Every structure is written in C-alpha cells, then in structure tokens.
C-alpha cells in the first residue's frame, strides 16, 4: 500500500476536493431536462479503498444517473458471463481513431470499443440473451448491488424517458449495426435500444459508486463485503479499456497526464481506479467541451500530482 | 439537330443494342426477392425524340421499379413547386468525396446531393408538405404520368414492402437525419422513409421512362403531348446533377468518357439524356460492382464514340 | 451561334465589367511578393470567339503568371502528344473528394485528376521525356504560343525563383509521389518539380489568354490563325476535367451555378471556355476563401444568367 | 518484487523462448539490403531486472539496427533536457486515428505522437539545437552508452547510407513538416532528415539493449551502474506512449493484451518494460503484417499469460 495513515491520507482529499471547488467553468448538459435541471455548484467525491476505508466530501449522497459510466461496468458483466473472446467477436479492443461516437466501424465492421455508444449498444445486447427485457433490466440492478455493496442503486424513470424520446442518434446507430449485422443472431434491436436507455439511466451516489469502482480495485472483490462480484479476466479487461478508452476525446490526454483507468458521463460523474488501492466516484454537473466534468477532471490530474498514483510513478 | 435521318439513326441503336446484348457479366440484385427474380437476359433500349419520334428494341415493355432512378424526377419536382433557393437550404450540389451512400453529410450538415439516398431521403421530405401521404403519393404519380405522356407509370407494392421490412440502412439515414436537423420543421421522418419507398417503387417500361427523359432532353416540355412539365430551372438543375452525381462511384468516369446526364438505378436502368436531342431507357438487371448494368453502361459508351454525343463533343 | 451581333454582345460585356468592378472583397495572394505587389484594382476580361472577334476592357495588357490556369494547358499537351490511355495510366479523371490538394492519391495510388497539384505535377514528367528540362520549356512555351496565336506569351524568372523556394508542399508532394511510383521509370523528380515551377511561373495577358481558351472552344483550331493546335480527344478531356475540377473546392458550385469549363488560378485569373462560342479570360488578384477571383466570379455568374451560356440551358 | 527465485524465472524464459521458436512465420524486412541480409532463425531474449540480474537465451551478441526502437529512447532524451512542456509544444501525446504512419497531423498541426516518423521526425529536431550534426549524434551515442550501462552501442554506416537513399517517404514528412512550420525556429530539415536515418542506424545487441529496457524499468537508473540516466518524468512520458503507441497499427491489441510499454522496429527488435522489475529486449527479424516481430510477439503474449506481468493484473 501507498498509503500509510488514511487519516491524512483524508485530509488530502480534502484539500484537492477543496481547490477543484474553485473551479466554476463547464456547462451543465441539458440535452435532457432530466439533466439540465441539475445545479452547477453540487460536487461530490467518495473513497473507498481496498481495505474497506471511506471517506467523503461535498455532495456524495445526491442521486445522478451513471450514464456512459455504465458502459464500463455491464461491459465487465459481459465479459465475465461470456468471457473474453465471445464479448469481442462483436466489439473491438481500442481507441476509435477520430472524434468518439462518430458512427462508424472498425475494419472487421465491429464497433471500436465498449466505451462508445455502438459499442455499448453492442454489448447490451449481448447480456442474459433469451429473457426478456424486464428480467436483463433485474439482473443487472443486482449485479450492481453487489458491485456496490448493497448501497444506493437507483432508477430514473423520466431520465429513461426522455432518453428514449429525444435518442435519435442512437436510432440511427441501432439501425446501422443492424444493416451490419453486428448483433446476435434473434436480437430485437429496438428492445436493446429500450434496455440501453434503461441502463444509462440507473442512479447511484458518489458513496455507492466509489465501492463499485473499489471492486474494480480490488480485483473483483468488493471490499465491505468480500465477495467476488467480477472474473479477474473481467476486471483486466474493463481497466485497460477505461484506460485507453474512458473520457471521450480526452482519453488520450488522461492516459498521459493521470495514467489510471477512469470512465466520464454526462451526467458529470468520473468513476476513477487506482487498483489495488482504491475505488473513487468524483460528481460535478457543469462539462468541458469534451463532455467531462470541469472540476472531476481538475481534481484527478491534482490527485496524481500529488500521490503519485500513476501508471508509471 | 444531330440526327438527319431517324431510320438510319433506329438502324444504328439496333447495332449498339445487339453488340451490348453479348455483355453477359455482372450480378442481378438480390436484396430483396422482387428484384432477384428477374432474368439476367433481359435487355431494352427505347429512344423518344424531342421530335416525338419513337424506337425501341428489345424488353422494352417489361415493367420494372425505378428504384433511384427517381431520384432525379422527384428532384425536378421538387425544384419545379419549390425553386432552386428553397430546396438548397436542405440539400448540397455536387459529388460527395467518397464512396456513394456512405452515411454522412457536408460541412453545412445538409446530404452532398439529391442523388445520393440522404439527399433524396431529404427532397421527399419537401414535397407537397402539409397533405397526406396518399395525397403526396398521388401527386407525384400524376406528375410523373404528365412526364411519360400517359405511358404506362404504376407500383410495385410488394417491392414497397420489401424495400420497407429490409431497408435498415436507410432507417439509420432517417434518424440521424432527424439528429442534424435535416428535415423542415413537423417532419414525420418515419412517414418521409415509407413515402421514400414508395417512390423507389414506381413501375415503369423503357418505353414510358424514355418520354420521362425526352421531357428532361425537351427544357420540361412533354415531346409527345408539348405540354409543360417542368421550370426551365428545374430541368438545369437536375441535369447539372445527373452529369456529376448520376452513376454512383462511376459518376466520374462516366462524365468523363461518356458526358451525358443519367442516373442508373438498382433494377439495372439507366434514364439517359441527350440535351435538344432525346431521351432514353437502357434496361439490363445484371449489375457491375458499381451498381450500374453492365449492358447499358456498355451500350452508353458505344453510343457515344459512335454519334458524337458528348457534352464537350 | 447565339451571338447574332457581336456589338450588342460587347455592349453587355462592358456592363457586367462594370457591374464586377465595385466588388472589392478578397485578398491578393501573398505567399510569394511576386504575387501580393499586384493592386487589387486591377481588373480585366477579354474575349475571342470562334469567329476570331475580339473585345477587351479594363486591364487586359498587363502580364500576369498562369499559375494554376496553367495545368490544363500542359494537360491538353500530353494528351496530345500521347494520347489518353498513356496520360491516364499516371492521372486520374475525376475530382478529388475532400478539400483540393490534400495530399492524397486515388484507390490506384493515382491523383485524383490533373487539374490538383499532385496530378499535374505527374502530368508535367509525362511531358517530352528523355529530352533536357530546357528542351522541355521551350517545347511548352512554342505550344503556347500556338495556342494564342503568338500573342503575349513570356516568363517570370522572379515568380519561378520564388515558387521554388517557398513550395515546401509541393516538394513533399513530389517525393510522395516518387514513394508511391507515380512517375514514368527514370523519371528526375527535383528535376519535374523544377520544369513544374517554371510552368506556373508563364506570364500572359487576358488578350492573350483568351485565344487560348478560344482554341478549346473551337475544337482545338485557333481562331485567329486556323492551325490546329490539339486534338480533338484533347480538347475534349481538358474541358470535361476543367468543367469539374477546375475551380478548387468552388467547382461543384461552379459546375451547377456556371455550368462551363473554367479554370481558376492564384494569380487570379479565370480561363473560361464556351464551347463552340468563345473564350476568355478574366482577371482580378484579390481571391476569396476557396482561392478564386472575386470579380471574375461574380462576372460569370452574371455572364450565364444573362446570355444563357449555362451547359444544360 | 514478483520473482522470488530468479533462476526458475530464467528456466521458464527458456520455455517460452523454445515455443517462440517453432514460430516460422513472417517476412524479413527487405526495402533495404541491409535488413534483407538477415536470417528468418535468428532469435535472441535478454534480460536485464531491476536488481542488476541477467539472463540471455539464443542469438543475443548479434548486432542489429535499433531504428524504431530508438524512438522512445531519444524522445526520454528530448524530455530529459527540455521538460515535458516544450517537447510536448511540437509533439502531440497519443495515438493516431487511422493506420501508423499515414502523413498528417492532429488538430493543431502537430505530429500525433513520438512513435510515428513524423513525430520522432520532430523530437529529433529538439535535440541539442545549435550544435552541428557530429556533436548531436555523439551526444545522443553518448547517451545510449549511459543507458546500456556501457554495453554494446554501435552504427551501421551501410543502413544509414540506404536509409538516406531510399527515404523517400521520410522526405515527404519533412518538406510537410516544414511548410506546416512543426520544427523550431532556425531548422535545417534536411540536417534533421540525416540526423533521424542515424538514429535509426545505431547498432545494439539484444543483452545491450535490455539493459536500456531496464534502466526504464527502474525509474531510470542504470541498473547495472547506478547512475542517473533520465528524469522520471522522462520515464513516464516515455513508458506512457509506449503503452499506447509502441507496437504500430497492434498497439491498442498489444496493450489489452499484454499491457506493457513495448517498442517495435523493422530489423525485428521489440524493447519491453516491466515497471519496477526487469528490461527485455526480443529479437527475431521476420516480421508481420503490422510490421512487429512474429516471435517477438507469440513471447511476449506466452509472458504475461505466463508470470501475470499485465498492467492490470
Ligand atoms: C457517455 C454519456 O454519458 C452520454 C450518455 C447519453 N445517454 C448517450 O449519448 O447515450
Ligand atoms: C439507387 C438504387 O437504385 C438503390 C435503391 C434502394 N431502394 C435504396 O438503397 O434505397
Ligand atoms: C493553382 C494555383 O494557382 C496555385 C499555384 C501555386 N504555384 C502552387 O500551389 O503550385
Ligand atoms: C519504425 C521502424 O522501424 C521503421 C524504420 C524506418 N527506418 C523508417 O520508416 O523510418
């Protein structure tokens, strides 16, 4: 471990928590009323370690929907209910090479990487295949729970509902991976669409979603409850992809500059991994323009600056 | 006028036709049932005079869907109710950069042009606003029978249905259509694409399409009824983008080598335009890899090395 | 003809001069002093018909470089001297699909057409091969000479010494092109980038500018001295390819708006050919955006929709 | 430390490089004689660990050429010297869109990466400026020798004198890295050109390079010297976007499923880094498809699969 006195290790946290405060810029999405309506000022962050140690500060007790925070996590369910080389015979392994969520295709015309929209898609419709949407929808709120130790997992029906009504891009790219057959064989693609709604608009709070990303630290083991939740192969896979793949058109930078596995949302939510350390959900509505939160993103490259958590500090 | 002698013109088309019949290569379409079952052998050629003389040869009263071969009709219509300005504000004027149909737009967000399926998806959004599909339906079946004369113009429902059921692709144009904006306010985009099919599957004969063409040839007025059809303007413009953007990938070669306005279509026509001279219908099913019937773009260039037709000729 | 008095014609000549004159806006190249000395007032249009009538007004006795305008001339040469299965070998034959002169080649390794740097760079080693980069000069400026009747036809050394000291795209052109095999074998490229500088760097004046773009309109015969210049493949090629690629990334609207053969250059000079009608040239330094003429835009959209010179009116 | 016993670790290495063996497949590079030279059946695997411990199996006292090897180590060089802010001025940091090496920029008109040729083109610019071309490359020979501990460092005068000749690609990138102005004020590219076929010219064995491989790994101090080499934000970077860069067009494979910084080069050389435990250099020069060495790449996978290396294991 890196960290010897937790206590002081808080302390820090809160400092960093502190002067990302101060940092106002951004726009809160609004594409959704669901989402405009959220206040700029609220930002949270919560810590739990591998250990089981917590630790929050701010507004870590709000409810917001994980939106593209999800990919990574039924990504890492799909991976470890099918394995590694099922999932990518229908998705790719890295960086799409332009902007992200271009709509288009690799060269064996798969989705580049579950960490965009096809290949969420993608990998939605791959989960708990021949029941229906109602059961894949149950099945994976419990997967989440264990993930989360049992802590705030939420549904945000208007968040849904506005999702599917105003999701015209999604459409478009439902109906091209169809024209590519890019799905498994007897897939509905528009109930996909429905369940890919629905799984972006799961709830959770700051505290909720640090114990999901600490089992992500801690090998697929949730650290306040000791059970194994993931295949290690699952959690391997999830990490290199939110490595690579996690913060939209800014993947490339944070990889350079932080060097850890994280995955942004519109939601302005960063779930964050420093494995075999600790899990940390940071939340702040307002966004850059390349759609992740202002102040999250300024308090992870001061995290690494300071606790030399890099990949390769 | 080209063309002293219209019998010893009529004697040469036979020849053109009869060494083009002797073309067996390329692949009848097969996406949908109703354009598998046709016979690769079929093969008609029908000319009609701005004059309002007449020849055919060959097949050339076997109906057959017009497919994109509307694409250019349903244009002119639209320019000829709407003006240039008006239907520019939806759609661009020239070449996409590459491949034909491959899903995006130009720097204005609007589809590259009318003969590609975004931009044609777009032109039908523009006609006759306000009225039903039925009334919309029937308007332009009445202007397309005014086009032909009152030769044979009909429907091919169980094309419709097909072109519906299968067509994925252009449901992912539709909605991402809808994303960009792409249509006039109140667009029903899910009525534009059964509209849209519907048009694709017009029924036509050589023999009716060459007096479309004559019409295109004849600055709007009908060669068979002398009654106008279409705006001067209307008749410009549509030819400008059948010279550059009618034969898919091949547009390029094709006005190179052959300079005239066509547009080919996926049931293997090819409605051709020879300005002040006449209009032409070249059928054949089988398909090169481009999309264009091999017997007609054979016969086209023949055509073209043998009377002195092209545009910079 | 459609000019029944010539008078009455230049009569309305001198209006839409006039009527161009008080369009000031654009900027006169500068990335050579040779090219930002010249005023921005400068402004003339010649014609030549058919016939071999002339008219000029404004500015049509000063000498400027061809610069671009230039690459259909040496084009129409090769052909000529080589007929158009060899040329094409090396050159493609349609525009290029994103922005003009992006530095890229076709699906064959071939530039898109001749009328973009890459592809008349080719053109140019095609050009009198295994004889001395003199003899070559020569050959060409004799050509030209043929071209315009020996009217004003000469040499910026200045322009040239320039063009090549500054052309750092056009040298990376040039050996990405020898990477890709695009030259004839033993081909000197330094050497053909060399005799390329020098072409741009020919100086006419709109005089004689004009009988060269009569040429082209008369079928390669110049109409001032009855010889035959150019093939009638020649002609015919370079005004297809001038019709579509010659006005940069303006030539689609061009093509639609305009619908003549012309071709644009930084000098600011328009080569405008109507065929079997008369040529011209039209020149003023301060270029727009896409690098064409503001008044000798503006003056052939008011030529067309005034005499009806569009290709498909 | 993940290896406990260092001589079963070294029986395992000897395993993994007899499987490697039997892989025949692959292509020697041939576009020079100098890499045509060599044989398809050599095959070396060094190591050099953290602790100064070494272990060499196969053919690993025979020099070969660095070439894109080198990349790395004279980007840690340039950030070494200059800091990761005025490297990065000139230099972007991630991967390219599209295939490895294919002649453009990012947004801002600046190579994508160090790995690419245009941007090692580029960080070869930054090094030592205002020293001639001898006092650079001894510099940077001088450098190699620091951080092979003294081990072999060599040059092949015969690669280089082909590489020169042959460059032509390479040439391009610097007449287009110059007109886009990429190089600091005062640049000879040409100079530069030759400095960078050096570079790629200099000579190592697989047990020399294995310890600049470690001396990467470990923070950069020579593990077999002690001293300092580079800074350990030069490791970071450099360690960073070999992660993510350092395999071409395989990279994003290589990373999920090995997840170790790597460097590849034509002459078949692949240099590995296990943070925090050992350098390896592989050596076999038949290559991919991708242009990576075909044993170089079974080893390293059967490596991590083996003693559970991975990143995010
Ligand atoms: C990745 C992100 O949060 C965007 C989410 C939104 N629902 C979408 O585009 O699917
Ligand atoms: C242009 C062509 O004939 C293809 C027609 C087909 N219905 C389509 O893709 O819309
Ligand atoms: C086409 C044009 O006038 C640009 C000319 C200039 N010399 C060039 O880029 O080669
Ligand atoms: C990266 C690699 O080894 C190719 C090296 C070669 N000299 C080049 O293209 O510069």
Same mark, same amino acid.
């Given at each position: 471990s890196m960290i010897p006195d937790f206590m002081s290790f808080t302390s820090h946290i809160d400092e960093l928590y502190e002067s990302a405060k101060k940092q106002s810029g951004g726009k809160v999405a609004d594409y959704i009323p669901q989402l405009a309506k959220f206040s700029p000022d609220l930002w949270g962050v919560s810590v739990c370690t591998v250990d089981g140690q917590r630790? &929050? @500060?701010?507004?870590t007790k709000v409810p917001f929907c994980l939106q593209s925070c999800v990919k990574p996590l039924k990504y890492a369910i799909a991976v470890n209910d099918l394995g590694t080389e099922y999932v990518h015979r229908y998705v790719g392994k890295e960086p799409s090479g332009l902007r992200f969520n271009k709509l288009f295709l690799n060269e064996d015309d798969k989705p580049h990487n579950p960490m965009v929209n096809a290949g969420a898609i993608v990998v939605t419709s791959l989960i708990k295949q021949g029941v229906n949407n109602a059961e894949k929808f149950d099945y994976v709120m419990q997967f989440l729970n264990k993930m989360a130790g049992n802590e705030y997992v939420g549904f945000s029906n208007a968040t849904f509902q506005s999702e599917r009504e105003s999701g015209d891009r999604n459409f478009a790219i439902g109906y091209y991976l169809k024209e590519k057959k890019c799905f498994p064989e007897g897939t509905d693609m528009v109930g996909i669409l429905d369940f890919y709604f629905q799984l972006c608009s799961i709830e959770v709070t700051?505290? &909720?979603? &640090?114990?999901? $990303? $600490? @089992?992500? $630290?801690?090998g697929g083991f949730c650290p306040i409850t000791g059970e194994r939740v993931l295949s290690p192969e699952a959690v391997r896979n999830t990490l290199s992809l939110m490595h690579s793949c996690g913060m939209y058109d800014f993947s490339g930078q944070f990889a350079f500059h932080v060097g850890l596995p994280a995955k942004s949302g519109v939601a302005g939510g960063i779930l964050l991994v420093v494995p075999n350390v600790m899990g940390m959900m940071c939340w702040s509505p307002p966004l850059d323009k390349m759609g992740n939160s202002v102040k999250g993103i300024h308090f992870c490259h001061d995290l690494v600056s300071l606790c030399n958590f890099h990949n390769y500090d």
């Amino acid at each position: 471990s890196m960290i010897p006195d937790f206590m002081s290790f808080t302390s820090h946290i809160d400092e960093l928590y502190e002067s990302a405060k101060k940092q106002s810029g951004g726009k809160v999405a609004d594409y959704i009323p669901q989402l405009a309506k959220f206040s700029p000022d609220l930002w949270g962050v919560s810590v739990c370690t591998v250990d089981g140690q917590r630790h &929050s @500060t701010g507004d870590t007790k709000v409810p917001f929907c994980l939106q593209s925070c999800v990919k990574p996590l039924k990504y890492a369910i799909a991976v470890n209910d099918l394995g590694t080389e099922y999932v990518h015979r229908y998705v790719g392994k890295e960086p799409s090479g332009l902007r992200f969520n271009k709509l288009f295709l690799n060269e064996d015309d798969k989705p580049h990487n579950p960490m965009v929209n096809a290949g969420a898609i993608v990998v939605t419709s791959l989960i708990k295949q021949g029941v229906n949407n109602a059961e894949k929808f149950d099945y994976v709120m419990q997967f989440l729970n264990k993930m989360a130790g049992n802590e705030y997992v939420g549904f945000s029906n208007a968040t849904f509902q506005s999702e599917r009504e105003s999701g015209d891009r999604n459409f478009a790219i439902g109906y091209y991976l169809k024209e590519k057959k890019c799905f498994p064989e007897g897939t509905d693609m528009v109930g996909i669409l429905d369940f890919y709604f629905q799984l972006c608009s799961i709830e959770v709070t700051c505290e &909720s979603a &640090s114990v999901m $990303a $600490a @089992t992500l $630290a801690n090998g697929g083991f949730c650290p306040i409850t000791g059970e194994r939740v993931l295949s290690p192969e699952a959690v391997r896979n999830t990490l290199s992809l939110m490595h690579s793949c996690g913060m939209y058109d800014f993947s490339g930078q944070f990889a350079f500059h932080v060097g850890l596995p994280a995955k942004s949302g519109v939601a302005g939510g960063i779930l964050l991994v420093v494995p075999n350390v600790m899990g940390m959900m940071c939340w702040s509505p307002p966004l850059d323009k390349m759609g992740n939160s202002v102040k999250g993103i300024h308090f992870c490259h001061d995290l690494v600056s300071l606790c030399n958590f890099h990949n390769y500090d």
